[PDB]
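Priority: low. Protein: Plasminogen. Input follows.
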Amino acid sequence: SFDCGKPQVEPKKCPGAVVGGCVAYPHSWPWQVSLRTRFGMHFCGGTLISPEWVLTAAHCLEKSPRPSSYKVILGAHQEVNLEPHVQEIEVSRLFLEPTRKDIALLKLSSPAVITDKVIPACLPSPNYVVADRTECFITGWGEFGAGLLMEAQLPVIENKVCNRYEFLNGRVQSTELCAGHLAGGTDSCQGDSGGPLVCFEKDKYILQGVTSWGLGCARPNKPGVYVRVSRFVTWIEGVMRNN
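Result:
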């Protein structure tokens, strides 16, 4: 329950060839956040990147500018009947990324207790470019909702290829990345808007992508598009240290 990116429960690691993905082993994605309204309704995902900081998608915040309207559920596995020791914390502040405005930082009113069920994802070094065909996972509750936390393994597709004429045709910005399959492939729509796309780097998981509604999920004849986290690291750190 220490270093970022190292679950204390080892991930199942759903093979890429499973349709619909797999149910995660409980607490194997300890940074996984469930975003809810004050009335406790799950509508988005997010990633714990510090005891006091959650990274999510700006689109998740469209229905309200008031930081008190949002609750962050950490340590969860079930979507509805929440586990006994799940941490439920009010957001004190919102910081919308200013250039692209696709992601946001939520500051938690009280810090999260770091345990072996609740651990931060590691951030990539600035401007890092995840290589073509790197295997990553997306996790979340697919929000019928999944009910239990799901995972799916998706390969990254370099922007140059993903932007080809016959595929996404120039619409993927350098501040985004693609993952999934170009043609064929299973529908991998297991994440929540705002949820994580992490990739294992020899001994820990690094958050490389943030899923977005208005972008997409990995579909059979179209990959998913994720905000490229490495391009917002210095900003993220700046917000954290100065706030």
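The chain has two helices and 13 strands. Residues 175 and 228 are 5 Å apart (CA to CA).
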